[PDB]
Every structure is written in structure tokens, then in C-alpha cells.
Amino acid sequence: SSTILVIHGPNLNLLGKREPEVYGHLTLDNINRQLIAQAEQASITLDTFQSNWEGAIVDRIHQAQTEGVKLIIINPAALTHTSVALRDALLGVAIPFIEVHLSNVHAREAFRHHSYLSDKAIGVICGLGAKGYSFALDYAIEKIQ
Amino acid sequence: SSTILVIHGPNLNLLGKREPEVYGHLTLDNINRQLIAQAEQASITLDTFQSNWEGAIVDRIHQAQTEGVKLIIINPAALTHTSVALRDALLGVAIPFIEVHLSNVHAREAFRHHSYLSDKAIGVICGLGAKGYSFALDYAIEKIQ
Amino acid sequence: SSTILVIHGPNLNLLGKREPEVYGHLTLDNINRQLIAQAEQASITLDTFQSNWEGAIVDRIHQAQTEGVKLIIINPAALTHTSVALRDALLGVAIPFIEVHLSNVHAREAFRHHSYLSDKAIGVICGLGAKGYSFALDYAIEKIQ
Amino acid sequence: SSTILVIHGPNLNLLGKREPEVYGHLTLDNINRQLIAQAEQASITLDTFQSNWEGAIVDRIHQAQTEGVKLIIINPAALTHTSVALRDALLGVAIPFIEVHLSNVHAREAFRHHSYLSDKAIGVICGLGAKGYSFALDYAIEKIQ
Amino acid sequence: SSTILVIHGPNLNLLGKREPEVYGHLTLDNINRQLIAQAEQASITLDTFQSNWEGAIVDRIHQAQTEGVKLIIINPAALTHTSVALRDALLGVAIPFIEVHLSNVHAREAFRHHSYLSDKAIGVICGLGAKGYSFALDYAIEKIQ
Amino acid sequence: SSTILVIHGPNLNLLGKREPEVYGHLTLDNINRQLIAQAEQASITLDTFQSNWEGAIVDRIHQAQTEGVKLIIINPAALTHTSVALRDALLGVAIPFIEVHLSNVHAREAFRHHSYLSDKAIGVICGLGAKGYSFALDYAIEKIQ
Amino acid sequence: SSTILVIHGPNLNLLGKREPEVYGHLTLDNINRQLIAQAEQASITLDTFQSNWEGAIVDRIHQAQTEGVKLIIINPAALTHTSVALRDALLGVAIPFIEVHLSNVHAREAFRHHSYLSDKAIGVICGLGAKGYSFALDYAIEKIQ
Amino acid sequence: SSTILVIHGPNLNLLGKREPEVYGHLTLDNINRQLIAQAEQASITLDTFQSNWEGAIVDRIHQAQTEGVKLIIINPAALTHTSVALRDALLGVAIPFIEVHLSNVHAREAFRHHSYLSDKAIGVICGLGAKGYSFALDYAIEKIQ
Amino acid sequence: SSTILVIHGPNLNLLGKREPEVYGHLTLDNINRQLIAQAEQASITLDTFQSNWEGAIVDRIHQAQTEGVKLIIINPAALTHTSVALRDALLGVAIPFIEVHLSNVHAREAFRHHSYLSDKAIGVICGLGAKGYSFALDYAIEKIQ
Amino acid sequence: SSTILVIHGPNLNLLGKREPEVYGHLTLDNINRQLIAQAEQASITLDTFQSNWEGAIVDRIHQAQTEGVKLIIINPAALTHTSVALRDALLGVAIPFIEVHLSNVHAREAFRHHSYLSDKAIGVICGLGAKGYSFALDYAIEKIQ
Amino acid sequence: SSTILVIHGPNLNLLGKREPEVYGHLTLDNINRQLIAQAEQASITLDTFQSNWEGAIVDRIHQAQTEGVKLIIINPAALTHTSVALRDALLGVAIPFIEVHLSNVHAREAFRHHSYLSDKAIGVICGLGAKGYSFALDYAIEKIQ
Amino acid sequence: SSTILVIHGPNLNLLGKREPEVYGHLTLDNINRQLIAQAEQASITLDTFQSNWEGAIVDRIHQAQTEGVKLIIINPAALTHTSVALRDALLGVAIPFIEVHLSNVHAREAFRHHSYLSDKAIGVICGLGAKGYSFALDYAIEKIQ
């Protein structure tokens, strides 16, 4: 029933809890409405999902195949560096995806430069905050037609 | 209750799900039945377990110790490359194990050559498809009475 | 309510499932009680948590922020080597922590020398058995007061 | 200061030159007009520059300092992997920039995973073809406003 | 003629020749007889070859092409880690092969983790003693019949 | 002398010779008196030693064997990363030891992550300031029974 | 019918220095003449080009596509170890090429063992002096007709 | 006798067996006869040798010294990557050599980039098929005079 | 007189910009005049050259050999880390050189610790700002007078 | 007020001990008098020190903080590659320093390219002989007013 | 026999060619006779073996086990760096061995620092010429009584 | 003629403090006396030296050149892996040396495989216990006629 699925990895539920300094008030829910609205404007159905449990995300990707999800926008967050299971899930279902990160990963610790997903994504957007999700959706829409 | 436990890692539930010749026709369920039948022929009880959640598999291994499981045949799939927790579960319960992979892991990406389990398995079978599980079971049967 | 939080990672529930054979007779429960008792003597509230599921530990760390936990004492066990999600959880909630390991890690396989948490901990204690947790608490108490 | 400069690196002049696809038709000139048009529709002035000569590009970013330039969108192409001179040019003029690549750089040779620019960029977009420039521009436009 | 060829690398002639405990009582000749019988039972002809000389094995593999050998079961032993000539022999004659090791190669020195053959084999069996050959043969029989 | 020896490596004499934040109040002598007191309180004799000279420390470790020292608590400071001679002294005399560092070694330069002692210590404490010495001693007292 | 283009990289203009033997008498122009003559002898047109500027060479390679050049013989010299831009130029215009070096590159510093071209050349000739260009031309002629 | 010796390594005897598709119709014997003829035309004697046995090639190189061979043209094939014995043979007899490979070794697996012979060869030719031998011979002729 | 050439690499034309607090009081032009004056004061002619184009600097080094330049003082800037071409230009013309960097190159990012020039320089000066050029010149004067 | 301390590391006392052939004839004492003189002419007091014992040098650096030494010129010699204790001494006293080496360290063995001091020095002078000390003194003088 | 076997690897048969410079005057036969004589003086039986063929050496080591050889003195020459087969032969027959090299292996190319035998030898002697063999023999004689 | 100097490194004074075997009995003295006796039987004067202090050993090596020592036999023990200062001492005095180790250094930890002396020694003996020193002395006597 849903054309595009947005997946948020672990810790992203913490957006907007931190402070008036570190981030402002933008929360995961705010991003989700903005993303739903944008899809609705383009007559596309859009579902979202967040968990801190790798298996929950894997399950959800499997469920997306049965639901005929055409494209996934995923921010795997920390799991990009660690989860080959997440990689094999996306590959196994054969749903193309776009990888999104809020922050510039290449600007932090060296271990963050490695991704188990990037080489198999259509593309990647790093360091543009929430707008990254939006840019990925815009591309996805362009490609769904 | 069960002398031998067969563990399937993440994504193995997808076997046979893209039926017309992507992965072919064989399912996880099919593999399980073949193995249960083989064990029954040799008067050995055999349980199986599959999950996409690392913690579920870890829990299962612990339960296996309390059940007196004698040997584990495990296809950790992606987790072989990533999970020291899975390694420490198997070592902590001290149940010998045989590592099985359907595909030839050495023929794919370089990150798939590294295993957190292989050096502690009795042995390993890769690349022989489902027959790998059957060979492991055959071996396990002869090791036991 | 609960004031200092102690987190035990995967497989630590196996402590004392045995004679003198991986360890002696000390259990996770025994360690916990000693810790609760030590904190009670200093008029500090202390909660504990263990799980074999990475996501359950991540969720618990998030809950800790809401409940105003001032300091976490964490034995991530295997997860120290593998989980950047755990790192990002501790960092995202901005609760300082002390890393504790029962055994000496540096005396085992090379892959156990790498930690995704050590560099962000206040400090680390390895190889001193359960007393490591007590020392961490002692330090945590003096840091609070 | 409310002008934007788009820099194309070496070999991007070859876009569209080999008749049909894979990745035919679309040319550098087409991309430039699209971008100019997009900047005109938001009342922003946009220049473009392509060269196969590192020094020409370095000169051009020194010029950009002396003129209005508030943000650079750069596709360095091959120079991403090789030119610290390009890095020190962007850092020396202190003009923020967004790195863009048409293709998924992580999906090709290992030497393409290294970038002398990425860690200093605001952000990076790879693998989304020409839309990547457009997305970088959209972001840039709501960074002046 | 030949149909399935079993190749034993250097030092495998020593099997069962430091008779007390280490190794076992089992000899290379015993393994060969067992395999010849197993093949006879399935109406397949099976030849065997051992040498401590790399060139002899290479020559043998060439001969196998001219004899119309359908599948090779090879235990290259030490040569796995060192011989690209061997690799290029197997590839040059284009006869599929299964790699077999008696012992768990991944449990020993790090230099044993590397193979110049594994990535081109159908599959690999390590650490199951002589039964590994037998399993390889069982797989081979089914592939032909 | 005798029973427990505390060794301080190079540059630890500078403690509390800077008053402000780039050290603080606490001197090396203060630490020494605290430990002596703590040992006296448990009826254990405790000697201490500092030097900036690798040989002096080595000579003292040899002397410690003659004196029947039961356990060493050592903060090798910079020598942890460089001195195999120190490692061989401790191993040669066969006196178990506990490694202590004031600061969190893992939070600093990558060359401080390597230790020529850690793997042979009973255990290691880093990042807990002077209290690290006290915890090591507490452990040392309980173990000498 | 056919142009062959010979490209000389940076510093090859210096051929003919401390003339009676530091290197020999032979100059770049001499090499060109022999090559031009050789080609005329086989009714093939042959242009040549040298520069010390990466961009000039790159521009030349683009011009070659528009000129219908069939094969390039390139001595990139120092640029073989540094220029992915040069690689992408040759690949982008899709003109097969032969890589030539006067001196034996493997016999010098380790950084000269790496090439950004070699893996995409038809073949490579190193260490045979100027005869290497002639051999490459001889091969290019046969290959064209 | 101005003798030149052409050495063919392991698996080169297979040339012209897998006839129509993967590689062509040309044989080792063909290559040899063209080379003998090319040498006769220039009044130089030329012997040839192929083996799959490292020791046979080593013996042959020693004989070459006693026969007064002036120059060796060697295609070590797989042995280039593995045989320091072959290197030391060439060095020990002090006969200059040219290294020849039919295929472009740099275009295949990363392990093929390493050579135990290249750094000591006069030069190297890869990827030009059998003409590589002819070019080496032509160079050898001019060198000997 | 006895001509000395001072080469400034890419980005050094960025001279001084926003002077207070971006360690940039003095221009490239100010350094040049100072050096010209120092050379005039010792009766030595001194030319200077800056460019952002590698090929312009290489060309200038070739012209310097024909002009009988005795010694080069070069601040390659970024080029130090990337240009073997530059290295080969300096070695090909055989003009001894002194490498100078304004900033302490070893104090910045790890890729700045590698130089394609240092090992062939007479010596190197880093970190001493503009004085470093003046010290190189002084040394160059004593070497010729 | 402003003492400047020159420290010479191990083996530098051998300067002038196999005098010919115009390579190594100036002594350490010559260098010292030459520096003392240069300092007296600028009304700055200058002490010097040489040892072959790491601890002696570390003691001197500590004494230098007590004495109000404003800047250290150090030629650690072999110790630059090995001594983190030296690094920590200079950092612990917070006396800025300039690293000097007589020979060009980058032109010798690869292990000489690593320094435990360089990244924390103001700057470094390699390869200019004894004149490197003088240039460091000249810079040091101008820095103290 | 009460035997000591002496094994010489590939290229050691060349000892003796070019008396003045590359090679002194000692031959393999001289060495042998000098060792036989030494063994006879001590009433010990000594055999010797040289080959350029790995397999021949391996066969000889297997033969030595049947003959009751007590200790092997092996100069594996080039095979020390390449042959795990040789390693597994010596281990498989469980005859202790002493490794000998004529030249200082550590003074030559980096690849000569690696040995597949050294870690399993009783000891190793390098760089002492032929006397190395004599010293190994002297040790071997004292060991057998 | 004159003197041979035997240098013992750190911890070698501990020899003989634990029977029957952790290598008990034999003392450094015992060794020293043996070597003195052996040199007196060949009319050679032999001095010996041991320290745990790197600087004491360095000083002794300088005060060895002055006394016309002709050859040094050094067991640097741990310092072989760490001391470039020890290297530059032996090289600065230009006294040839032989490196000796009691134990097989290649059988122990990987960090013991690296030496800062080996490559400059005449040769090396490891793993032959105290007889290694004798063998070195025997060699030294024949060399120093």
C-alpha cells in the first residue's frame, strides 16, 4: 500500500531531545510529517519506520518486499559502519535504496568513513541535515514515474 | 529435549521467496524438513531456529545449554563477519559447532573472508548450498551416539 | 529515581552457570546485590540492567536520560568491539560512563584490543573481575558526592 | 555576497559524447542551463566553470573570493582523490562548498573511496546523476535566505 | 577412464605414519580406497593422485583435461597458501573443483587463512577430517547425476 | 620494602608542579603518602619508586625479586608504549603486576593505544586519576591471602 | 582509416642532458622521427604530443576522440603514479592505449610500482628504452590494418 | 654460439587447447618456431624451454650459465608472483633477463601486481600477447649486437 | 653572480587575507622583496616564481637548467604530497634544492607527513614561517660563495 | 630571564672522531661555542647539554622549567624515533621547542621518517648540518621580543 | 644411522663462480666434506642432500624419518621465504632442525625477513658463511649426548 | 692483536634464578668465564659488560672505539627491538658486530621479529642458548686472525 519507505536507524529517535544548543527542536516526527506531506503533494504513498533494534529494521525491509515498496530511503545511522545483515537484507529483497546521513560522516572519526551499504545504494547524501531526506525523496519521486 | 540444534542467521528466511529462478525454489522450511527427516532416520532429535535478531540467537544458544544440546550446526550468515557476541555465546556454553554457508563466501567481497566464528568451529562448509547442512548433520551424527 | 545505572552486555547472564570452569561460582545477580548495597551505604540509588539484545541496551540508555541518570557504569562485553550504535547512544544522551571488563582483553585475541567506547569513557578497568565494577562505583560516588 | 559558483572538474566536458546510453544524451551544457535557470527562478546569480587543468580551477576559486562568491558547488571528479592543492584553495579562500558526484563513487574502485575534499565540505551527494547538482543548489539557495 | 579426480597435496602421504595418537591410524591409502568404493557404488570412475612436487600436480591437472575429468576434489594442503601456478592450472583447464582440508585451517596460524584456490572453488570443506573428501564426493556425484 | 611495590615511570614527578588546570593540586608525593597509609591500614608494607631513567626502574624490579615483593603496581607512563626491556624485567622476575594510568590513554593519540605490558598484567586501570592506584592496591591487598 | 597518437608525459622533453652518458645522446625529437618514419613505412598517419601540463595532455586526449584516433601509445611518465584524471580521460574517450616507460619502473622507488593506468591499458612495456615505443607501434599497426 | 634462452613457465604448454572462445588458436610450439626463425634471420642461436616444475626451470637456468647463454627471455607466468628461488637462480648466474607476460597482469587480481623478478629484469613487457616475446628478442639482438 | 631560484607552489599567492588572527600578516610579494634584498646584499642574483599550475612550475625548473641556476629554494606547498612529476623535474635537471614550508607540516593531517621531494632535498625547513626561506637562502649563499 | 637551552641527543658527542675526508671534522664543542657566541651577541644567555642517557635529558628538561628556560633547541638524534618519554617531558614542562637534525632524516631508512616530537615542535630543520642549530637560535632570539 | 641430515636448498650448488667479487671460493662440496669430517671426528654419521626442486627436498625429509634421522641442519635458501610445504614436512616428521643461512638475510630485501621455518627451528644462524653449518653441527652433536 | 668486547643487554643479569628448567643453572657469570677462557686459549683479550641502562651500553661502545676493540659480540636482548640509539652507536664507532640471542626470537611474539641491529650485523645467532656466544667468538677469532 506504500510506494516509498523511509527507514531511520538507532538513536535517531533522540532528535530534538538534546537541547537549545546541540540541535534545536527538530525531532524525528517533524521530519516524518514533512516527508509525508511532500509525498502527498506528489500523489505518492510514504511510510516510515524507526528502531534501535537491527532485527526490527531487517524484518521491516523483508515486509517491504511483500508490500511492493518500490524504493527505500534509509538513514542507517551507526549501522552503516557495522551491519552486513542490513546490507544483505536490502540486497536480498532487491529494493533500490538511497542512503542518507544528517551529519557529514567524512568529517568525524575514521571508522565512520566505512559503510557496508554505500557501494550498493543508488546514491548517498551526507551532511545536509534533514533536507537530505527531502532531496532523496525528490529523486525517488522523479524515479518512480 | 533436542540432541542437535540447527541455527539459521538473518535473511535466511528469504530463501525461495523470489521464486522464478532468483535464489531458485528451495525454502528454509524445505531445508529444515530434510534435516529433521535425516535426524529421525538416525534416531536423533533435531530442533531448528531462525531469526533476524542477534539477541534472539544468543538467547537460543543459552537455552541450548540448559536443554543439554550436544552439538550446534550454525549458518550465522552475515553475523559471521560482525558478531563477537555470537562467538562468545557459543564459547560461553561450550557446545561444539559446525559453521555452514550456502554460498562460497571466499568468492565474494573481501569483508566476507573474515569470521568471528570459524577459528572456533570444529569445521566449516561453504559453497555447497543446502547439502552443506546435511553433511554437517551426517558428521554430527557420527560424532554422537 | 534510580540514580547511577549499571549496564551488563550480552552473555554476562552466564556468570556462575558452572563450577570453576569459565569462572568460579559468582553470578550476575551476586554482583548486582553487592553494587546495590555499596550504593545504599553511600545514600545513592542504583539500578542495573542486562540484555543480550543491542537494541534493548540502547533503549535503556535512552530511558536513562529521561530518568536523570548522572553516570553509567557499563560492561558492554562483546559489544565494545562491534557496536557503534552503543557509542552513539552514550554520546547522544551525554551521560558520562566508565567501561568495565571482568577479564583482561588485552591478554586475548587481537580483535579484543579494539573498542568503540573506550576513547569516550571517563576511564576503563579491565581484568580485575567483579571488583572492577565496585571500583567504578567508588569513583562514581566521589564524582557525585 | 550572494552569488554561487559551480565548478566541474576534469573529463566532465565528455558528458553525452558517446551517443545513446548507459548515461548518454545529457551534456555538461544541458546541466549548466538547468542550473542557471534554477538560480534565475530564485533571483540568484550563478556562474559555471569546467576545466581539465587543476591550476585553472585553483585560479578560478581565488577569483571567486575577490568577487561575490558566497558558496561553491564543486564536482572535482578525478581530482577529489588526488588534489590537496584544490583542498587548500577552498580552505584558503574560506568559501563553504558542497561536493557533488554524478556516479556512486563507493560502487567503483577502492581508490575512489578516498577524498581530499569531503571532510571539509558542508556535505556530499554521490550517485544521483545531475539532480545532485540541483539538490546542492536548492540547499545553497536556502542557506543565503 | 577417470571422471572424478582426487588430488592430495604435499605431506598427505604421512597420514597414519607417526602411528601413536597424532594423526590417527588412518592412511592416505585408506582414504583413497573408501573414496574409490563410494564412487564405484554410484557407477562413477574415480582416480587419485598424491605428490609432494607442485609440477607433478600441475601436470596431472593438465592430463585430467585430456582425459575428460568432469570435477576435481583437491586437498592442496600447504600449496593452498603458496601456489598461484596451481590456481592457474585449475582455471586453465576449466574443470570445476572442491577444496578440502582435514584440519580446521582457520584455527591455526594466520598465514593459513589465505588461499589462492578458495575463491574459485565451487566450495570448501575444512576441519572434518577424511569425511570432508567423502562429502565433497557425494556433492560431486549429485552434480553429475 | 617488601610485599607491594609501586612504580612510577618518567615525568610523573612533574605532577602538581603546575598549579592551574594543565595539572592541578595533587603531587606524586601526596599519591605516595595516600597509598602508604592505605597499605599500613591493612598491615601491608608498601614501598614506592619513581624515575625518569628506564634502567633505574629495571634495576628496582630486579631488586624487588630479591626483597620478596609479592605484587607490583606500575604506572609506566610513556614507557608502556616503548619499553620491551621493562616487559622482560617484570616477566623475568615473575612478579604479577597491575598497570595504572592517570589519564584515559585511549582518548589521546593512536600511538598511546599500544602497550608492551598490558597483555601480561593481571589487569589495567586507565583514566581514573590517582584513585586508579588506590583501586589497584585494594585489589592487591585482597589477592595476597 | 587510421591515426595513431603518441603522448609523452612530463620531463620527457629533457631527453639529451649531460650528453655523452648520464643518459645517452637520444632526444625526444629523435624518438618522434623514428616513430613517424616507422608509421609512414606502414601507410599509417601518426601524430605526437608532449607536455609538462596534465590538462594539456587531457585536452589532447579529448581532441583525439574528435579526430578519430584509433589507438594511443602513451608514456605518462610521472603521471602514471598520480593522475586519475588521465585515466578517466582515456576511459572517457574509449581509445585503447599502450603504456610505455623508458626505464624499468619496478627497479626504482616503491611508489613507482603503482599505476592509475596499467590495469586499463592493452599492455605495458617498461625498461626497454626508446625501442619500447617502436614495439608498441609495431603492435598497434598489426592491430589496426 | 651467441645463445639466447627463452624460458616458458607453468601452464604455458596449454596455449591453443581451449580453442575457439576463451583465448585463441596459437600454441607454444608456434611461438617457439617464430622466435627460432627470428633468431636465425639475425645469426643468433636460440634455445627454448618450458616446464610446470620450478626445479626444472631452475636447473635449466644453471645449465645456461655453463652453456654461455648471454641473455634470457623469461615468461615465468605464475611463478613471477611466488618464486624467490627463480629470482635467485637468475641472479646467481648473472645472466641478464627480460620478463614477458602474454596478458596484462595489472588488469587481473591484485596479487598478480607483485613480482619477485621485475625489479631485476632489464625490462618487462605485459599484455601484448606473443608479440611480447618477439619484441624482447628484437631488443636482445640489438643488445648483444 | 650565481643565480638562485625561489619557487612558490599553489595557493601561496593567497599572501595575507584577513590579517589579524589568520597568521597572515605578510604577502608573497613581501617575502620575495626581502629575499631579493638579502641576495643583493651578498652579490647574488635571485629570481622568484609562483604558480597554481604544476606544469608552469615544471617548465620553470627546465628553463632554470638552461639559465645555469645553481640552487633552487622551493616551497611546493600542497604539491609536495602529490607530484612525482615535480620530483622528476628537479632530479632530471640535477639542480640541488632546499624544501621550505611556512607551517609545521607534521602538526596537521597525516597525509601531510608524506613528501615526494624531501628525500632528495639537501634539507628541509618547516614551521618557521617566512624566516624559513631566509634561512634556506643564507645556507644557499654559503654553499656557493 | 631568557635562557635558551640546546639539547644534543645520543651519539652527537662523536662529532669529529674519524675526521677525514672533509665530512665529519667539526666537533660538538665547536657547534656549542658557535651558538654561545651567537647568543652573547644578542644579549641572551644560552646553556647546552648532551647525554647518551634518555633519563639525563629528561632530568635536564625538568630542571629547565625550574630555571625559566623560555625555549629549547633540541637535536634528539636517534631518540626522535623512539622516545615518547622525551615527548612527554617537553609537553609536561610546556617549554616550546625547535627540532634540529644535522643530516636529512627523510633520505635514510624508512624508520627515520617517524618522529615522536615533530608534531609538537614549533618547527623542524633537517639536513643543513650545524647551520640548522644557528637558524633555530636566530628564530628563537626574534621570538623572545 | 645415528644420523644428522644436512639439507641445502636451491641455488647452493652454485657456490663457486667468480672467485674475486660476487662469491668467494668455497663450494658446496667443500662444505659437505668439512661437515662429514667434523661428524666423523665425533663418531656421528652424517648425510647431505641438495636440490633445486622443492619436492625432492620434501621427499628427502620423509625418507629421513624412516631412516631414524635425529636432527636436520637445513639451509633452505630461497624456500625459507616461500615454502609452507617444507615447513609442514619438517613438522610432520617431527625431526628437530636448525636453520642456517650463509649471508645476513636481514641485510637484504625486506621480503627476505619473513621465514616459514624460523619460528619452528631450535635456532637460526645467519651471516656467518659456511661456519654457520659447523656451529649448527657442533650444537647438534652436544644435543644427541 | 687486541680486544673483543662482549655486550649483554637488559635483564641478562637474571640468568640462572630458577631451577631445574625455566633455563636455570647457567648464570651470566658462568657464560662470561667460559668466553674469557675461550679467548685466552687463542691468545685474545676479551672484556665483557652488562647493564639495564641503554646509555651505559652506548657509553661502553664509545669507550671501545678509543680502546681499539676490533669486534663486538652483542646480545642486546630487548633493546634489539627498540633502540635506534644502540644502532647509531655501533655504526658511529664503525666496530663490526655479531648479534646473539639465547632464545629463538622468531618463536615468540611478533614484535620480537623486528630488529634495529640485525641488518647491520655481520650475522646473527638465535635460539642456541649460551653456545651462540661461543660460536660468535670462534667466528670473531678466525676473522681477527
From Swiss-Prot, chains A, B, C, D, E, F, G, H, I, J, K, L:
Catalytic reaction equation(s): 3-dehydroquinate = 3-dehydroshikimate + H2O
Top EC class, one word: lyase
Alphabetical UniProt keywords: Amino-acid biosynthesis, Aromatic amino acid biosynthesis, Lyase
Pfam family, one: DHquinase_II
GO biological process: amino acid biosynthetic process; aromatic amino acid family biosynthetic process; chorismate biosynthetic process; quinate catabolic process
The protein's annotated pathway: Metabolic intermediate biosynthesis; chorismate biosynthesis; chorismate from D-erythrose 4-phosphate and phosphoenolpyruvate: step 3/7
Binding of substrate, residues: 75, 81, 88, 102-103, 112
Gene3D superfamilies, alphabetized: Dehydroquinase, class II
Active-site residues annotated for this sequence: 23 (proton acceptor), 101 (proton donor)
GO molecular function annotations of the record: 3-dehydroquinate dehydratase activity
Highest taxon listed in the record's lineage: Bacteria
CDD domains according to UniProt: DHQase_II
UniProt site (Transition state stabilizer): 18
EC id: 4.2.1.10
Subunit details: Homododecamer.
HAMAP family: AroQ
Role summary: Catalyzes a trans-dehydration via an enolate intermediate.
Family: Belongs to the type-II 3-dehydroquinase family.
Protein name per UniProt: 3-dehydroquinate dehydratase
Native source species: Acinetobacter baumannii (strain ATCC 17978 / DSM 105126 / CIP 53.77 / LMG 1025 / NCDC KC755 / 5377)
